[PDB]
Structure 1
Amino acid sequence: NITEEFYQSTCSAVSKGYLSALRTGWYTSVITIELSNIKEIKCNGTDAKVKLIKQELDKYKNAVTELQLLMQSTPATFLGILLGVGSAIASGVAVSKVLHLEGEVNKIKSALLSTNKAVVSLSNGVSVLTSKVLDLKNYIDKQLLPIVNKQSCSIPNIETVIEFQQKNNRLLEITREFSVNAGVTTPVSTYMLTNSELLSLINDMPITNDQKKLMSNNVQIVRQQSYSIMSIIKEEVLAYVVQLPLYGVIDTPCWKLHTSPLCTTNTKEGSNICLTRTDRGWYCDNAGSVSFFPQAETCKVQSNRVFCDTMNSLTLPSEVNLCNVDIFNPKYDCKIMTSKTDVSSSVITSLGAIVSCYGKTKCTASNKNRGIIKTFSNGCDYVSNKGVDTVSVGNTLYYVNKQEGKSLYVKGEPIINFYDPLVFPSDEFDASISQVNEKINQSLAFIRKS
């Protein structure tokens, strides 16, 4: 149920019909692995099945020593320039710091003695979920101790050698990811947290039923917005913090704004003036205001659900939406940029394509079964994605999205015609309708002086 409207007057289009899924907070969980403390590998036997077990214990001990070197380092990692600067893992690292305090590990270790999942209140008072995901201590001590603890080693069966390599592999891969990521990984792989464990962790979290359903049906998105932070390894326990997203805003209207340069079409080369709406990005109603996301990557779309991160957003009054139907409205000052760079390009929207065609550029739209069906004249135009498969601007061939949905072409005079090119400011990168008007007055006043 996605719709789109193109505004010929402002060379821009809005895609409506989306639902919000904004990350507004973080939930920190502590994931543990019970380790076996092995120092000496006591066996002088040259048996082939013992040698393969000795070689896997060396890999095991190498990973332990490798992780111990990571815990000794406190781990870390148009209108985009207007944002702030957050600290993404500031919450998770804070939990990682507490686990270094004395006895804090013993709290975790004792709570995870009978069950593999428990809720622990730390010394500072925060209630974190704790999960023991692997008990290599139990396996090594019950299945491998009678082998490599005496001098007359008992030769294991071939099946145990294979089984130990499987169980040890997860530890090795967790160590591998932390080694090439300085102890902070994102997204969180299935080695840090399996699809079963993650879903189970979501169900046990203190969140609403709407958040549980949302997170469970989009765990791949949950992983891309999660961090895995190596913390400690001591007292036979490896602990790393998993920082999961909290979606405080769900199911509010979202819309995406696409913009393209709007220039004059005079045949004289340098006598053209351009103008581009700069407020392009994702917009989502949020607590009476509008959360605006100017960057491309910060929002991921899954069907009609938009997952965004508020740390890369601005908070604007809802009147910002008035710029779509009336860019000259007196309630909000719509942001634009100006130039004399009349160069051709295209923007692929959710349900169509905007084409800014200028100069000697060949701009067309094609179908697979029939070829060219529309040829654009100079200016800014738009074509729906129904019956159109590709758009061509110069030597560039853009495929359009085949998402189903109705588009609407809103006819209107391109607002660039309302300006006189002799008093038009054309070097404005962070400007607005009013900043241009007041700047034209100053130029127009100095002309009135003559």
Structure 2
Amino acid sequence: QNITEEFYQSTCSAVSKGYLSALRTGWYTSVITIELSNIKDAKVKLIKQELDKYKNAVTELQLLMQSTPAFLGFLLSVGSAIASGVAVCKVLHLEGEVNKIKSALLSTNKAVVSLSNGVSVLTFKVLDLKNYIDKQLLPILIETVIEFQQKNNRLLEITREFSVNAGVTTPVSTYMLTNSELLSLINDMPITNDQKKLMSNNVQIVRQQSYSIMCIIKEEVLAYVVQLPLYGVIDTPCWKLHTSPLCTTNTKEGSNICLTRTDRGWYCDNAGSVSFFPQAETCKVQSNRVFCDTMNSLTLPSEVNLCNVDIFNPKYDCKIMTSKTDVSSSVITSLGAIVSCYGKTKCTASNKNRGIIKTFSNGCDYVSNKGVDTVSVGNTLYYVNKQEGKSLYVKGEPIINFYDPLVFPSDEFDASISQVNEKINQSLAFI
């Protein structure tokens, strides 16, 4: 859609608006099964070599079944992403539970099984090795050799991925679940029509946010749980907040005070509140849609958005940190770049065909990506995002000029506007 961005000179921050939400709120757990076979000349020797790989893969999966679960980011909660999948896997260890799946997939490769614990799970049979080995390889004991290696390949690959990932893999590979299997799983998933179209148009993002959990191998059946994301929040407004240090620009070194907004990250409207994602690298952006997981979020009142327009508003205590580290840095935003230039650092913005077109002076400034290709801060070169969108420069006096350095708390790790004001009042009273 229409992505916009506003830079606030007063607080050295920028907000990118125009995004749509796709927040993970639930999990769909499906049981993927592979039917195995009960096993007690140069060409035939190749079959036994390939058959030993099958026997080793089963043994490795048995050993694998034993060892298996069966800025403000430090404020996040502690949870287990695969807990719902582990619950389905625990049920499969009950007596007769695997037989239910085995009987449901006797005539077809796709059925809905109601487990004993009550969970109704869609179950696939993606590879039938019992059918192949018992009917094609059992009576014998070059086309058979080649056909066997291709058919047996998927079991070997699934075993390798599970082995080097403690039985839990993410993203879900095409060997764990092919595109046709995943798309058909999405189509028959008991979800909204908006969710079906969303997941179908973003199959890769679904893979990256899914888990494959090695579960059980019993009664000639290998079963693993594929945990797919359910996006219960769709098409609500999201915005990304970029922050950078804001310092005074006094010439004499060591007399400068700094202030940095610590509330950077992704913000999305969610159920009357705002889901705040402090580590923006945990979200995946597709054009104008941002895919996040609510497990990596903090639930904040919607008034937190007021800190972008008025950092001194009384309705929300805007979070900042203070220091005297006036080092130069840059933040590449969605439609531009924030440049915090201090000291003797060379800060420029250049175009690919013409060289330097803007020289940044001391302080915090901003340039849009229109006509700009790269930004240099010191000895480092940064490439700006070339995505289309309008940027708006909101002129304002840097709020750091409002503070007296003699009483400014110049080392607050995780403070706020009111917290700094309270400390100033205590220091001024002593004077």
Same fold (TM over 0.5): yes
What secondary structure does 1:247 align onto?
A: strand
Alignment partners' CA distance in 2, 1:115 and 1:143: 20
C-alpha deviation, 1:157, in angstroms: 14
**CA–CA separation in structure 2 for the residues paired with 1:140 and 1:74:** 28
Aligned-pair identity in percent equals 98
CA deviation after TM superposition for structure 1 residue 297, in Å: 2.1
In the TM superposition, what is the alpha-carbon distance from 1:54 to its structure 2 partner? 1.1
Q: Match for residue 102 of structure 1?
A: 95
1:56 aligned onto 2:50: yes
Q: Distance in 1 between matches of 2:281 and 2:326?
A: 27
**Aligned counterparts of 1:157 and 1:113: Cα–Cα separation in 2:** 26
Structure 2 contact 68–166 (Cα < 8 Å) conserved: no
Deviations 1:357-396 (A, max 9, x none): 0000000000011100111110000000000000000001
Q: C-alpha deviations, 1:317-372, integer Å up to 9, x for none?
A: 11111111111111111000000100000000000000000000000000011100
Number of matched pairs:
430
- Report the secondary structure of 1:402's partner residue: coil
* Rg larger in structure: 1
Unaligned runs of 5+ in 2: none
TM-score (norm 1): 0.94
Match of 1:330 in 2: 314
> Which blocks of at least 5 consecutive residues in structure 1 are unaligned?
41-47, 147-155
Residues of 1 paired with 2:60 and 2:321: CA distance?
52
User: Contact 1:60/1:172 (CA < 8 Å) preserved in 2?
Assistant: yes
Q: 2:374 aligns with which of 390, 412, 417?
A: 390
User: 1:268-315: per-residue Cα shift (whole Å, max 9, x none)?
Assistant: 100000000000000000111110000032101011110000001001
Q: Distance in 2 between matches of 1:163 and 1:326?
A: 68
Distance across 2 between alignment mates of 1:223 and 1:79: 27
SS state at 2:313 partner: coil
Please state if 1:87 is matched with 2:88. Answer: no
Contact 2:349/2:358, CA 8 A, preserved across alignment: yes
Deviation at residue 73 of structure 1 after TM alignment:
2.8
Deviations 1:46-99 (A, max 9, x none): xx21111111111111101110111123428x1111111111111111111111
Tell me the distance in 1 between the aligned counterparts of 2:66 and 2:405: 63
1:152 equivalent in structure 2: none
Maintained 8 Å contact 2:29/2:88: yes
Partners of 1:28 and 1:243 within 8 A in 2: yes
Distance 2:281 2:405 in 1: 36
Cα contact 2:319–2:417 (8 A) shared by 1:
yes
The aligned residue for residue 73 of structure 1 is: 67
Q: In 2, are the aligned partners of 1:29 and 1:243 still within 8 Å (CA)?
A: yes
Paired with 2:361 and 2:201, the residues of 1 have a C-alpha distance of: 46
Greater displacement, 381-390 / 80-89: 80-89
Corresponding residue for 2:416? 432
Task: Answer whether contact 1:228 1:242 (CA < 8 A) is retained.
Answer: yes
When residues 409 and 341 of structure 1 are mapped into structure 2, their CA distance, relative to the original with a 3 A threshold, is same
Q: C-alpha deviations, 1:197-240, integer Å up to 9, x for none?
A: 00101111110011011111111111111111111111110000
Whole-angstrom CA distance in 2 between matches of 1:309 and 1:110: 36
In 2, distance between residues paired with 1:278 and 1:179? 40
Return the offset for 1:141. Answer: 1.4
In structure 2, C-alpha distance between the alignment counterparts of 1:426 and 1:83, rounded to whole Å: 26
Confirm or deny: 8 A CA contact 2:246 2:364 kept in the other structure: yes
SS of the residue 1:24 aligns to: strand
Contact 1:278 1:335 in 2 (8 A): yes
CA distance in 1, matches of 2:142, 2:52: 18
Q: Is the 8 A contact 1:49 1:157 kept in 2?
A: no
Residues 94-115 of structure 1 show CA distances to partners (whole Å, capped at 9, x for unaligned) of 1111111111111110011011
Structure 1 residue 189: Cα displacement:
0.3
**DSSP-derived class of the 1:165 partner:** helix
- Normalising by structure 2, what TM-score? 0.98
SS at the partner of 1:297?
Answer: helix
Q: Is the 8 A contact 2:68 2:214 kept in 1?
A: no
Counterpart Cα distance in 2 of 1:323 and 1:66: 55
For 2:19 and 2:40, the matched residues in 1 are separated by: 58
Aligned to 2:186, the other structure's residue is in SS state: helix
